[PDB]
Amino acid sequence: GEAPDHSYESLRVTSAQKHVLHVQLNRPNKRNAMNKVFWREMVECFNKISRDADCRAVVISGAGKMFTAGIDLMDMASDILQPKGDDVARISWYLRDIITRYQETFNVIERCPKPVIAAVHGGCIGGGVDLVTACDIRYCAQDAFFQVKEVDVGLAADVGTLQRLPKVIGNQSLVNELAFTARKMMADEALGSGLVSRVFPDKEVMLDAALALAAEISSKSPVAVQSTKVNLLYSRDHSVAESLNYVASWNMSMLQTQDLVKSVQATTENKELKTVTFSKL
Amino acid sequence: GEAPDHSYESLRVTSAQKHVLHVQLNRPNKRNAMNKVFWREMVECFNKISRDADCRAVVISGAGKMFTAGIDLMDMASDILQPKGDDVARISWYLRDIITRYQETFNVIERCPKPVIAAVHGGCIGGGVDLVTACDIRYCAQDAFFQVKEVDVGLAADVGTLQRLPKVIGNQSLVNELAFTARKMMADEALGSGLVSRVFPDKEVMLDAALALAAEISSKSPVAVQSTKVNLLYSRDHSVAESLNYVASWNMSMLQTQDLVKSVQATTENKELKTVTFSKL
Amino acid sequence: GEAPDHSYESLRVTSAQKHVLHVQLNRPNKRNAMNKVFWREMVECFNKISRDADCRAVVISGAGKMFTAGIDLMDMASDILQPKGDDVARISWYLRDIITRYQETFNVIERCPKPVIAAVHGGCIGGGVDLVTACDIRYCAQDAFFQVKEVDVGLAADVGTLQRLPKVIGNQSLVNELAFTARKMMADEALGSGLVSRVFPDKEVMLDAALALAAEISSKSPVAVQSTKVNLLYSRDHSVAESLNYVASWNMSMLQTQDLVKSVQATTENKELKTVTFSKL
Amino acid sequence: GEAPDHSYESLRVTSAQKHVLHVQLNRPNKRNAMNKVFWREMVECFNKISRDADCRAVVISGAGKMFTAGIDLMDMASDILQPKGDDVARISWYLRDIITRYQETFNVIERCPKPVIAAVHGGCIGGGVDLVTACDIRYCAQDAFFQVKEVDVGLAADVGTLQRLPKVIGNQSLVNELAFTARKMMADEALGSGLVSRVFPDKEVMLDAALALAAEISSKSPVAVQSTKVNLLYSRDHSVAESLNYVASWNMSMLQTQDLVKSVQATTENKELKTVTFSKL
Amino acid sequence: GEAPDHSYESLRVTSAQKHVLHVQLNRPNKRNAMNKVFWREMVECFNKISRDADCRAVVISGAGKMFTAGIDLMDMASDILQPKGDDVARISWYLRDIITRYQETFNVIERCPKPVIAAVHGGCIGGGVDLVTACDIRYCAQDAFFQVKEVDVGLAADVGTLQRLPKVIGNQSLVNELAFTARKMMADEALGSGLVSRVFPDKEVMLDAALALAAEISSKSPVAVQSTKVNLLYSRDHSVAESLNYVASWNMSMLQTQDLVKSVQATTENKELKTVTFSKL
Amino acid sequence: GEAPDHSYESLRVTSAQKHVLHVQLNRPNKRNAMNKVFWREMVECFNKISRDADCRAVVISGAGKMFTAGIDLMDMASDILQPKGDDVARISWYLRDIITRYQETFNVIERCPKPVIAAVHGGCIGGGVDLVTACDIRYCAQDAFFQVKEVDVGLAADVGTLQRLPKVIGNQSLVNELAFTARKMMADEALGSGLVSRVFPDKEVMLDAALALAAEISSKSPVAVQSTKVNLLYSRDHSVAESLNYVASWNMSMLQTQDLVKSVQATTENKELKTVTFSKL
């Protein structure tokens, strides 16, 4: 059961439960290696998701043994090792265009108003860290591990690892230790450092709980949920004083909604918020 | 024993020990619900505290079973559900004024140079999170729990939760999980995430230790303590390079104090810093 | 075995293993007290380290019983208690110059492209916190403890503690508790708060593992390692959107390196990255 | 004819024409010297103006020969030359409070959503520059001149001159020349540098044209006019990319207004915008 | 003679001289009114221009009597007056999407590395100001005038006028006067305020000189010209210290170009820079 | 008559009048070409000037026919055309170090608390623009002209032209026109654009008036003058709200000066400020 608007050869988007989309990497044979097709499809996929009014939560998982094997070196070797340009200056313009495009692949996850939940089972190596670091909520199984493979490949992480990983956990000493040595951080250590919110025995239990969390989010008011993410992202990049100003300007319109009337009515009564239906956003 | 300058019908400010003010929410019957009277009194109270030279530490606790029950829906329903304005644009201006005024209620806690210690016993629901997130140091009892009820009510947190909660803990995955689902985070989970500094068996033990901590702060130099908070708050909203510049400009005057002479003299000797008296600030 | 270019009376820089420099505080009799000589030598030392192409990692440890005893009050009393200037305005200019120079002592550690690893054994009091908070990776022994002694001395931390300590750990409640009360935070509590990455039984085991970590960093590509720190530091002071732009402009030149060809060649094969040699940076 | 809500002994607020308030400094004998009474009344006056729905434009002029004679040295000598505080640190806190309060006197002019028009006749010395630099539109007569007298008094401008004057004109070379030498800049030179928008033969012609400009502003949509100032002020303090984001969030509510329907209807027809009436804001 | 890749029904892009593109609004009958087709075509057109290696300069002019008549009210009335959404919150999301898309129309002009020259003849009303304010260099004829019609329509400028107009001229008093009153600013006044660089007797002379300026830009090194615009735009939105850091990171790659060798060789000799050919960028 | 502490082979610093230093480029034969010796001497010179208590104003002029001929291509060709490094990544690090050092040459002019006055006679080509754009006040003769030669050389201005020139004049259209075409802007056009403050018939009259302006600045309070520049520079890089906070923290110490007592005493009386002597700063 597809979207069915979402048809991709490297992703499988299946609508699960209600108002919940399950975006699943669909390259088990290559361990979900991020080839050239993957980068463009993610931008196309999460642009449709943002325009989708029915969708209220997004769950990102992986097929096969592991979540992802990182960047596909074979395809991306040609772009870096054989660039286009007569001299260095022309090559730098060519490379900066490629880097910017690949950064857009993970920006759309952050710019998507719907919450994104990452279900990581098995290894999450290299560029896969950027995939989960852009997600709002991160879950992992017992066998999962996170590795910043970029230094081993020979380049600094330029797709989002060095820009979001220090901003999603507080143990900055660990962040430097991981980035500089490219060592594997197991699930138990990940939970202690706050990279993930919960740890589950295996993929099946993790996936069920991740979808259950998405269903709970979809039950809430879509306006309140979407506005919460926008202000949470804005507050990260700005000071407290500016963020307080921005949320005042943002909420002066979002407060005039029928969701507020119904949610308060349900809250004052004993009815659960799952019963009350909200309009499409 | 009041201030006695602090006389309010929703707050009870009692001077405890020396140079320590115990601001206590005083609506046990309504579970310290934040009605219209509460918002204006907090601004009035913490403005006097800042002007108070004798006060050096502030402890915020609650009366009754729980710390607070969040925003009072009955009083605040009229402002949101029945706004003033001919059309949407006029309503937006009216709502933005209300939001800005309510944000000022918690800003004065942060702008107060004296350190603020939060003693949370029982539930801390909804807007009460903003009350403690603006405090410098957060304590809790074993039965305490923190809940961001705003999404359940039907609106994004626009009084300070989404602006300070991600900036007081590093586990950003938990922050998104709490905000989006509005679930209750118990005391044990709160300590692990760093929202609180200590957990105590009950309110009585927590309150005694909170006042003991405030007494220790009051023993230190008021200039050094007040300057520390100003630079700590400034460093949060600015880069390292700018903050280092600001503290150099800030300390070039605060270093010329008699406290430095006496504190060093006490430190060089065996006398405790509690013995040496400092001038009013 | 000195650098031998690094000859100082308060520091001992010994080249250990390969591409690893072991900068060691060398005043055991005074417990590594930071006198006037220490401040200027650190600036001189880490300026040479940055220009040193062979060096790829830096380890900061201490001699004697403890890592450091903080600022030397006897020498620094004259500067603060007996300043130069006819009136307050002239004194403020004189004091601001002193504060700015002492801040430069710890800035060069952060500005040094080579990673810096701190090995803390015994006490780390007062200004020593700024020494380790500027380091990328912090290790400690079982007996180590970190104390912000500045408030006890009678002044706010103006050399980097209040500016970097909140930005290296997420438990902001603890940061305020430490700064305001100047209490000692033992090694076990430090590990829980994320100030340190690992805790070792004693100095000997901690030092061996710290040098082992530095050797692992030196094995990686110097271009990738140095670029990683620059982007990690930049991402801390800037938003995600700006940092993504900066790394794109930074990596468009650093991608055109022979390290990328060799590291990928080793990664595609079974050869360890320690075998492949990289050019001096 | 007063407001009549605006009753002050140093200001005279007269309602002129319709939706236009004429705030007039009213100390001709002392040449509109800014005594202690003036500073507090301005904050009170422009807080009421912001809450005033009928007012749509504000014109600031002066009585007597000149617009203003700057700060009243006699009253303000006691605050600076005889401060309160045992030592320098206590005095610095006392002085910073005074400086911050006096800055609030001119901030409320900028924070007032209604446009403010400055009509300057005669001298505008010292702190009077901050009064006009906070205004949106500045007019002057032929005999008017602007002088930054702060350096002659012996202090740097700390009430807004050094913070807004470089941001209202582009000739930064002139700004440094004026600030450093405290020379008088006549009206003709002021027009060339862009400090004022127009120059008029005398006060009577300038005042009539200033009120005519305010009447034209009041004819426009109050929502559009008020929103324009908010975005213009925000765009000054922020980058283009952030400002474009903010105006999108601001206008998503202000676009849903009856003013847009009527203004477009008038624009499509031949009716002047002065005929169509708009609701109070 | 088209691009010929640029085929649009509202724009006419003709390749003039060498490495110069002449983008021309092509709706003379409707006075170049910006209908729905115009907004999407501009994004498509300037995306191709950026990817175009041969193009080195861009000239924007208009067909018919006037440069542009602003926004087409008839087409854009449906979007604003008849939005999509059950209540205000849904409408606000719908409107914010529309505003953001229309802002992207003018962002691509700024994000285009090639310099953009605006040739304005006849009126430039309303949204046309955003078109020229995003251009690097602005020219105008004797009969040209610039008007911010947004307030007359009934909304604040949300497409770029209020965000770039204060940042392209220094006379902030005039900017407020223009925005608040929506008056027409003739060419002579525009030159005095610095909105335009030159004024020409008519469109024919202005167009010839604008293309001559573009030819001179195309003669220079494309790497140096493109890099200059990137740093000029970055310096506008950032402080001096950050911009100096960014240009150092930007130029460390762009300095390694064959253009530097040839341009210096030509400069050392008497050969004009027009003779030396540079590689495509 | 030298400093005599300032002894350089590319600069001639002569003490003129009282508290005024006349820094003069001293390479007339090479038209004040900026060779490798020049860059390091400027950093050394303006570091001593900042530490110099007697100096209160600085005047920068040039010897020979013209102010300066820009960067010396012969010496700087080796650094750019023949860099050090095995591959591009090593070269980029080498080039970035060179660019950063050369930027420091002009930063010290801005960081010097004493005001700097530029006296430009004859041509001011290329890097000489950065020399004068870092100065507070710019004067020029009738024959002077300013040219941004960097694009003609083949590189973007990376020493300060693109970072400070847009921030010292408001005519941004002219800035893009100058940078992109590298044309010469004569003195009359420079005055109209606000790059210079005054235009004089020749060097002799310009130099006398520049020294007369410096003498007038030296007559004022050194604390007030130095503080004015610090806040003027800070206000440029920061918003109004932050700058108002910074000046409040800066002036809370600088207000407690004997200069304020004497300057007010002179101002209240008829004595000129030139008579009253102020202490060294």
Side-chain angles (χ1 to χ4, degrees), chain E residues 152-202 204-215:
Chain E
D152 288 358
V153 185
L155 68 151
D158 47 5
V159 284
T161 287
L162 301 185
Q163 292 72 25
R164 299 188 184 93
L165 180 61
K167 294 183 176 297
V168 299
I169 54 185
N171 189 8
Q172 297 299 327
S173 178
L174 184 57
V175 183
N176 305 330
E177 191 182 36
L178 295 178
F180 292 156
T181 58
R183 70 175 189 85
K184 304 177 180 181
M185 181 177 58
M186 300 303 177
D188 296 331
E189 183 179 1
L191 179 59
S193 60
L195 186 60
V196 304
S197 180
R198 292 194 61 184
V199 179
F200 297 94
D202 50 357
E204 285 73 15
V205 173
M206 172 195 61
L207 200 57
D208 297 331
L211 294 177
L213 184 70

Side-chain angles (χ1 to χ4, degrees), chain B residues 136 139 168 194 197 220 245 251, chain C residues 96 152 158 170-171 176-177:
Chain B
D136 307 359
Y139 282 177
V168 299
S197 180
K220 313 292 183 178
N245 173 36
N251 266 29
Chain C
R96 188 175 188 268
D152 288 357
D158 47 5
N171 189 7
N176 305 329
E177 190 182 36

Side-chain angles (χ1 to χ4, degrees), chain B residues 39-79 81-202 204-254:
Chain B
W39 296 94
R40 63 172 183 86
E41 287 183 350
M42 287 283 298
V43 182
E44 297 172 357
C45 178
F46 277 82
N47 285 330
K48 300 180 181 178
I49 290 183
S50 297
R51 309 306 185 187
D52 193 3
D54 291 1
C55 175
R56 298 178 182 177
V58 181
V59 178
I60 293 186
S61 62
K65 304 180 302 300
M66 63 192 307
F67 182 72
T68 182
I71 321 294
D72 192 6
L73 294 182
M74 179 183 61
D75 286 6
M76 304 309 167
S78 59
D79 296 2
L81 285 320
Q82 280 75 209
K84 298 182 58 60
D86 306 15
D87 50 356
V88 179
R90 272 70 175 185
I91 293 178
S92 298
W93 280 93
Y94 170 79
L95 290 184
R96 188 175 188 269
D97 184 18
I98 289 186
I99 296 181
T100 304
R101 290 197 301 101
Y102 290 169
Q103 292 178 357
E104 189 67 21
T105 298
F106 300 134
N107 287 332
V108 297
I109 298 183
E110 178 176 339
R111 296 203 312 267
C112 179
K114 327 295 175 57
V116 183
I117 307 176
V120 184
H121 67 84
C124 182
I125 309 180
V129 181
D130 315 70
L131 191 62
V132 303
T133 321
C135 300
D136 307 359
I137 305 177
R138 287 162 291 274
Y139 282 177
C140 67
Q142 192 64 30
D143 53 355
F145 62 88
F146 304 87
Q147 180 183 14
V148 185
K149 199 60 178 178
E150 307 293 336
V151 169
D152 289 358
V153 185
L155 68 151
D158 47 5
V159 284
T161 287
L162 301 185
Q163 292 72 25
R164 299 188 184 93
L165 180 61
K167 294 183 176 297
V168 299
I169 54 185
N171 189 8
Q172 297 299 326
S173 178
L174 184 57
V175 183
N176 305 330
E177 191 182 36
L178 295 178
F180 292 156
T181 58
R183 70 175 189 85
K184 304 177 180 181
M185 181 177 58
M186 300 303 177
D188 296 331
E189 183 179 1
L191 179 59
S193 60
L195 186 60
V196 304
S197 180
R198 292 194 61 184
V199 179
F200 297 94
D202 50 357
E204 285 73 15
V205 173
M206 172 195 61
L207 200 57
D208 297 331
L211 294 177
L213 184 70
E216 187 177 8
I217 295 183
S218 301
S219 61
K220 313 292 183 178
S221 168
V223 174
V225 170
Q226 264 90 126
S227 300
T228 302
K229 181 180 182 177
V230 176
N231 296 277
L232 279 175
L233 295 173
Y234 189 92
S235 304
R236 181 191 59 182
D237 295 328
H238 301 71
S239 61
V240 178
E242 288 190 355
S243 304
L244 289 175
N245 173 36
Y246 184 78
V247 66
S249 301
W250 181 273
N251 266 29
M252 66 182 176
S253 59
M254 305 304 176

Side-chain angles (χ1 to χ4, degrees), chain C residues 13-79 81-202 204-243:
Chain C
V13 179
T14 60
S15 60
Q17 301 172 349
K18 193 179 184 61
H19 307 297
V20 176
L21 281 183
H22 182 195
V23 178
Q24 177 179 357
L25 283 71
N26 200 15
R27 302 222 311 177
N29 291 15
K30 304 308 176 182
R31 307 180 305 168
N32 302 328
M34 304 180 177
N35 63 330
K36 287 187 172 58
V37 186
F38 169 83
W39 296 94
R40 63 172 184 86
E41 286 183 350
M42 287 282 297
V43 182
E44 297 172 358
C45 179
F46 278 81
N47 285 330
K48 300 179 181 178
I49 289 183
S50 298
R51 309 306 185 188
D52 192 4
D54 291 0
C55 176
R56 299 179 182 177
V58 181
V59 177
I60 293 186
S61 60
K65 304 180 301 300
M66 62 192 305
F67 182 72
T68 181
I71 320 295
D72 192 6
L73 293 182
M74 179 183 61
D75 286 5
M76 304 309 166
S78 59
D79 295 2
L81 285 320
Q82 280 75 209
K84 298 181 58 60
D86 306 15
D87 51 357
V88 179
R90 272 70 175 184
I91 292 178
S92 298
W93 281 93
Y94 170 79
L95 290 184
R96 188 175 188 268
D97 184 18
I98 289 186
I99 297 181
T100 304
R101 291 196 301 101
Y102 290 168
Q103 291 178 356
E104 190 67 19
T105 299
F106 301 133
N107 286 331
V108 296
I109 298 182
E110 177 177 339
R111 295 204 311 267
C112 179
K114 326 295 174 57
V116 183
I117 306 176
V120 183
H121 68 84
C124 182
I125 308 179
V129 181
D130 315 71
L131 189 61
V132 304
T133 321
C135 300
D136 308 359
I137 304 177
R138 287 162 291 274
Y139 282 177
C140 68
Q142 192 64 30
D143 53 355
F145 61 89
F146 305 88
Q147 180 183 13
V148 184
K149 198 60 178 179
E150 307 293 336
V151 169
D152 288 357
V153 186
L155 67 150
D158 47 5
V159 284
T161 287
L162 301 186
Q163 292 72 26
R164 298 188 183 94
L165 179 61
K167 295 183 176 297
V168 299
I169 54 185
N171 189 7
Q172 295 299 326
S173 177
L174 184 57
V175 183
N176 305 329
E177 190 182 36
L178 296 178
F180 292 157
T181 57
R183 70 176 189 86
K184 303 177 180 181
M185 181 177 59
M186 300 303 177
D188 297 331
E189 184 179 2
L191 179 60
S193 60
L195 185 59
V196 305
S197 180
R198 293 193 61 184
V199 180
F200 298 95
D202 50 357
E204 285 73 15
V205 174
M206 172 198 60
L207 200 58
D208 296 331
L211 294 177
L213 185 70
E216 187 177 7
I217 295 183
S218 301
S219 61
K220 313 292 183 178
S221 168
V223 175
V225 169
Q226 264 91 132
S227 300
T228 301
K229 180 180 182 177
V230 176
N231 296 276
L232 278 175
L233 296 173
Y234 189 92
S235 304
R236 180 191 59 183
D237 295 328
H238 301 72
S239 62
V240 178
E242 288 190 356
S243 303

Side-chain angles (χ1 to χ4, degrees), chain D residues 136 138-139 167-169 194 197 213 220 232 235 238 240 243-245 247 249 251-252 256 261 263-264, chain E residues 81 88 91-92 95-96 103 107 152-154 156 158 162-163 167 170-173 176-177 180-181 236-237:
Chain D
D136 309 359
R138 286 162 291 274
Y139 282 177
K167 293 182 175 297
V168 299
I169 54 185
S197 180
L213 185 70
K220 313 291 184 179
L232 278 175
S235 304
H238 301 73
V240 179
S243 303
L244 290 174
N245 173 36
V247 67
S249 301
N251 266 29
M252 66 182 176
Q256 321 172 207
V261 197
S263 301
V264 167
Chain E
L81 285 320
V88 179
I91 293 178
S92 298
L95 290 184
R96 188 175 188 269
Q103 292 178 357
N107 287 332
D152 288 358
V153 185
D158 47 5
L162 301 185
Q163 292 72 25
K167 294 183 176 297
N171 189 8
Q172 297 299 327
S173 178
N176 305 330
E177 191 182 36
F180 292 156
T181 58
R236 181 191 59 182
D237 295 328

Side-chain angles (χ1 to χ4, degrees), chain D residues 1 3-79 81-202 204-268:
Chain D
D5 298 359
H6 294 257
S7 301
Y8 313 103
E9 73 168 7
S10 66
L11 300 175
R12 174 173 175 82
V13 179
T14 60
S15 60
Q17 300 173 346
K18 192 179 184 62
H19 307 297
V20 176
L21 281 183
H22 181 196
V23 178
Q24 176 180 355
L25 283 71
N26 200 15
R27 302 221 311 177
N29 292 16
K30 304 308 177 182
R31 307 179 305 168
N32 302 329
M34 305 180 178
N35 62 331
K36 286 187 172 58
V37 185
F38 169 83
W39 295 95
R40 63 173 183 85
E41 286 184 350
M42 286 283 298
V43 181
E44 298 172 358
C45 179
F46 276 82
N47 285 331
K48 300 179 181 179
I49 289 182
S50 297
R51 308 306 185 188
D52 193 3
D54 291 1
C55 176
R56 297 178 182 177
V58 181
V59 178
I60 294 185
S61 61
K65 304 179 301 300
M66 63 192 307
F67 183 72
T68 181
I71 321 295
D72 192 6
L73 293 181
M74 179 183 61
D75 287 5
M76 304 309 166
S78 59
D79 295 2
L81 285 320
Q82 279 75 209
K84 298 181 58 60
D86 306 14
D87 49 355
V88 178
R90 271 69 174 185
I91 292 178
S92 298
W93 281 93
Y94 171 79
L95 290 183
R96 188 175 188 269
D97 183 19
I98 288 186
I99 297 181
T100 304
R101 290 198 301 101
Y102 290 169
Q103 291 178 352
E104 189 67 20
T105 299
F106 300 135
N107 288 332
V108 296
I109 298 182
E110 178 176 340
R111 296 203 311 267
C112 179
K114 327 294 174 57
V116 184
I117 306 176
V120 184
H121 68 85
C124 181
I125 308 179
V129 181
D130 316 70
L131 191 62
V132 304
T133 321
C135 299
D136 309 359
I137 305 177
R138 286 162 291 274
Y139 282 177
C140 68
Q142 192 65 30
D143 54 355
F145 61 88
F146 304 88
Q147 180 183 15
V148 184
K149 199 61 178 179
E150 307 294 336
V151 169
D152 288 357
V153 185
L155 67 151
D158 47 5
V159 284
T161 287
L162 300 185
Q163 292 72 28
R164 297 188 183 94
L165 180 60
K167 293 182 175 297
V168 299
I169 54 185
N171 189 8
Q172 296 299 326
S173 178
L174 184 57
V175 183
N176 305 330
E177 190 181 34
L178 295 179
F180 292 156
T181 57
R183 71 175 189 85
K184 303 177 180 181
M185 181 177 58
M186 300 303 177
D188 296 331
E189 183 180 1
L191 179 60
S193 60
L195 185 59
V196 305
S197 180
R198 292 195 61 185
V199 179
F200 297 94
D202 51 356
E204 285 73 15
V205 174
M206 172 196 60
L207 198 58
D208 297 332
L211 294 177
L213 185 70
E216 187 178 7
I217 295 183
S218 301
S219 61
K220 313 291 184 179
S221 168
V223 175
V225 169
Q226 263 92 135
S227 300
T228 302
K229 180 180 181 177
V230 176
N231 296 277
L232 278 175
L233 296 173
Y234 189 92
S235 304
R236 180 191 59 182
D237 295 328
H238 301 73
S239 61
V240 179
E242 288 190 355
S243 303
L244 290 174
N245 173 36
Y246 184 78
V247 67
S249 301
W250 182 273
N251 266 29
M252 66 182 176
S253 59
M254 305 304 175
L255 281 181
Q256 321 172 207
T257 179
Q258 304 299 329
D259 301 1
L260 201 156
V261 197
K262 294 176 293 185
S263 301
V264 167
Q265 174 183 351
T267 300
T268 49

